[PDB]
Amino acid sequence: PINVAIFGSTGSIGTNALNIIRECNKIENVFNVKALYVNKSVNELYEQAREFLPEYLCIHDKSVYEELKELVKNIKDYKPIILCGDEGMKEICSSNSIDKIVIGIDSFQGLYSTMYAIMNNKIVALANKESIVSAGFFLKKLLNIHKNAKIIPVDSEHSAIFQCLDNNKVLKTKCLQDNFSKINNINKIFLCSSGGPFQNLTMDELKNVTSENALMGKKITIDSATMMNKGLEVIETHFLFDVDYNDIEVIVHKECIIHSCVEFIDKSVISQMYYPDMQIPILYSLTWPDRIKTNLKPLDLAQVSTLTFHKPSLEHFPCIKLAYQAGIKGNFYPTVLNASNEIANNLFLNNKIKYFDISSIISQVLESFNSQKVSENSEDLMKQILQIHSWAKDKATDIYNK
Amino acid sequence: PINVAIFGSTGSIGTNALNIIRECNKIENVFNVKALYVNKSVNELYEQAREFLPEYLCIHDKSVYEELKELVKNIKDYKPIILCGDEGMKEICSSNSIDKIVIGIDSFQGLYSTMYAIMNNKIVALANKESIVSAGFFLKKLLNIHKNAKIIPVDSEHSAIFQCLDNNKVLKTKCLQDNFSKINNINKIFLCSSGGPFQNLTMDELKNVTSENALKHPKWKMGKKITIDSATMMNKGLEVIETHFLFDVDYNDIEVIVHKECIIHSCVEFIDKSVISQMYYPDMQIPILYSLTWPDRIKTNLKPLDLAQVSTLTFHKPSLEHFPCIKLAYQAGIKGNFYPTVLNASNEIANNLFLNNKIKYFDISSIISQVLESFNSQKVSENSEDLMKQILQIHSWAKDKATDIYNKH
Ligand SMILES: NC(=O)c1ccc[n+]([C@@H]2O[C@H](COP(=O)([O-])OP(=O)(O)OC[C@H]3O[C@@H](n4cnc5c(N)ncnc54)[C@H](OP(=O)(O)O)[C@@H]3O)[C@@H](O)[C@H]2O)c1
Ligand SMILES: CN(O)C(=O)CS[C@@H](c1ccccc1)P(=O)(O)O
Ligand SMILES: CN(O)C(=O)CS[C@@H](c1ccccc1)P(=O)(O)O
Ligand SMILES: [Mn+3]
Ligand SMILES: [Mn+3]
Q1: What role does it play (chain B)?
Q2: At which of A284, A313, A342 does a domain end?
Q3: Are the beta carbons of B277 and A296 separated by less than 8 Å?
Q4: Same domain, B126 and B241
C-alpha cells in the first residue's frame, strides 16, 4: 500500500494525479490518499475530500480557513486533521503515515514544499520544473544530506528519460546526484518538444503574435509558445541526470508520441512513447521502481501512422539559446533566467510587450548579472537563491519600465 | 575481460560480431576472441585467425582439415588447438576459458551448438531463430536443467525488446522461462518489420515475383534464405513464435507492424500502457554487442542516430492476404505442440524451391499450409534426449512431406 500526499491538488497536475489514483484503485487497492493541500480553492478541495477522505487537509490562505471547517462537518463519519499555511505544510511532510509526496504547486513557490519533503526523507514526485531550474544546486546539496530522500521526475519528458533507464543502474544512485549519467551509461539525450502553436510562423508573423494566439496553466502555455519551456527543461535535464549541455539536443516532434529518448554509450537509443497525457508520468513517479496495471487506452501505432522530427530554429525561438547559455555559464544564471522569464511571460500574457521583447528582457537581465560566491551552507544558499530570484524579477520589471 | 567464441564466424552474423569486437577493442581491451568455428570456409577462417589469434580453431568439414593446418603455418607466433566436426564443437563449449558463445550458424543446423553451449552453462548469444522456432520446448526444458545457462537474443527485434526491459526485473528470471512476461510486467509487444521488397505490390504483381526480384537489394548483405523469408514475411512469422518462446508472451499479445524506415526495431507495451522502444540505424552490431555486454553497456565509436536527419517514421498493419505466411505462423504457434517445428521445416523446403525458381510466390504458403494440415499432434516426450530426437524426426518428416507435395506437381 502506497501512502500519498498531493500538494496543489486542485491544479492541472493535482487533478490528473487523483484521476490516475482513482482509476488504479478500481483495479487494485494500491494507493491511499493521506493528505491534500491547496492555495485558496476551498470548494474544489471540499469536493476532493468527499471522494478520497484524506487524514490531512491543508490550505495556504488562512482567510478561507473558517470556510473549509464548515464545509467538512456534514461529510459524515470523517474527522480529518485540518491545517493551514507553511506550518500545516511542514506537519504533513513530517508525518510517518506518508511515503510519497506529489508536488503540483506551480512557479518558484513550489520550492518550499519540495525542501521539507526532502528534509523528511520522502519520495518527492516533482512536477515543478521552476524549483529545479532556480535551485538545482540547493536541491543537490539537500539530497546529499538527506540520503533516503529521492526526487522522481514528473515532467513528461524527464519521466520518459527516467523510464528509459535501467533500474538496476538507477538504484545505485538517484536523481540530481553527481555521476548520474556515468553510472547509467548515458551518452546523449533527445529532448522532444511539441514545438508549440507558433512553430510554423515566419519571423514577420512572430513579431506580432499575442497571448490570445498562444492560449495547462496559462504560464506553461506561453512558455510552450516561446519554447522557453524547452529551455527550462534543458537545464532541468542537466540537473536531474547530470548530463552536459553539449549532450542535450532539443528535437521538435509535433505528434507528441515519443516523449524523449536516451542515447547510451554504445549508441543504442531507447525512447518512451504514449499519447500526450500526464497520468503515465504521474503514475510512474508513484510506482517506481515497479509498474502497476491501468485501464488506459493502449497506444495504436498503426492509427498514429506517422512520426516527424526536425531541429528547432534558434532565430525564431531565441529563448532556447538563452537557456543553454545560462546553463553553460552555471552559477546563479539559471535562477536569473527563470526569474526574468516569470516577469516577461506575465507581461506578454497581459499584452504589455511583444514576442521578441520576452527574449530581449531576459537577455538584458542575464547580461547585467554578475556571478556570486556560492554559499557553502544550505540555509544560506537558499536565502541567496531567494535574493537573486527577487533581484532578477525587479531588474526585469525595471527594464520594462524604462 | 569477456572471453568469446564465435560459431559461424565467416557468415553475415559472424563477420558483424568480429567487426564490433574489433571496434570496441580499439577503445579498451574488453573482448578476447577464444574460438572460431565455421563449416568449409578455410581461407576466410585463416584470415580471421591472423587478426584475432584465437586459442581454438574449428571446422566442420573434415576434408578441409589438412588445408587449414598448412595455412595456420603462415601465421607466426600462433599455435592454436585446431579441432574438427561435432567433437571439436563440444570441446570448445566445455572449455572453462570461454564465457559467452555467439551462435551465427544458419538454419535448423544451429541447434546442436546451442544445446551443448547450454549444457555447459554458458551465455548463449543466439541469432539462429530456427532453433527457437523448431525446438522452443526443448530449449526451455534444457535451460531448466542447466540453471546457470542463459540465452540472450541477437535477432534485432528480440534484442530491441530485451533492451526495453528493466534489468532489475530481467535478473530475477531469464529468457525462455515460464512467467517471464509477468515478472517483466509485459502487456503487449510491437514486433516491427521492414516489410521486405514486395510490400507495395498488388495481388496480381505478387503472383509473378521471382527470387531475383527478392534478392537484388537488401539493407545489407544477409544470407539468401533470410532474404526470401523477408520477402514473404515468413521471417516475421518465425519471429512471432520466437517472441512467444523467448519472452512467454501470448500470441494475441504480439502485433506485427510494418516500419519501412527500420529505425524503431521493436516496442514493449507494459501493464500501465506505457510503451518503451529501442531505436538505431538498421545494423546488427548493436544487438550482437548488447548480447555480449548484458547487463552492462560499453562505449562504441558507432555513428550516432540523427533523428532530425531521419525526419519521418511510418507505421502500418501488414496485409494478411498479401503475406499469408504471417497468418500460418500465428496459427501454428497457437496450436502449439510440434506445429512450429513443422512450419519451420516445410518453410525451409519451400523457401529453397522459390529461391531456385521451381515454385511461385503463393505456392510457398500453399505448400506450408498443406504440410501443417497433414500433421497430427504428437505426445511430447518427457525426457530431453528423447524430445530432441522427436523434434529431429518431425523436422525430417515435414521436409519430406513438403518435397512430396511439390513432386505431385
Ligand atoms: N544475417 C542477419 O543479419 C541476421 C539477422 C537476424 C538473425 N539472423 C539469423 O542468424 C543466423 C545466421 O544468418 P546468416 O545470414 O549470417 O547466414 P549466413 O550469412 O549464410 O552464415 C551462416 C554461417 O554458419 C556456418 N555453418 C553452416 N552450417 C554449419 C554447420 N553444420 N556447422 C558449422 N558451421 C556451419 C557457415 O559456415 P561457412 O561460411 O564455412 O559456409 C557460416 O559461417 C540465421 O538464423 C539467420 O536467420 C541473421
Ligand atoms: C507535457 N509537458 O511535459 C510539458 O512541458 C507541456 S509544454 C510541452 C508539451 C509536451 C507535450 C504536449 C504539448 C506540449 P512543449 O511544447 O514541448 O514545451
Ligand atoms: C535484422 N533482422 O532482425 C532480421 O530479421 C533481417 S529480415 C528483417 C529486417 C529487419 C531490419 C532490416 C532489414 C530486414 P524483416 O524484413 O523485417 O523480416
Ligand atoms: Mn515538459
Ligand atoms: Mn529479425
Answers
A1: Catalyzes the NADPH-dependent rearrangement and reduction of 1-deoxy-D-xylulose-5-phosphate (DXP) to 2-C-methyl-D-erythritol 4-phosphate (MEP).
A2: A313
A3: no
A4: no
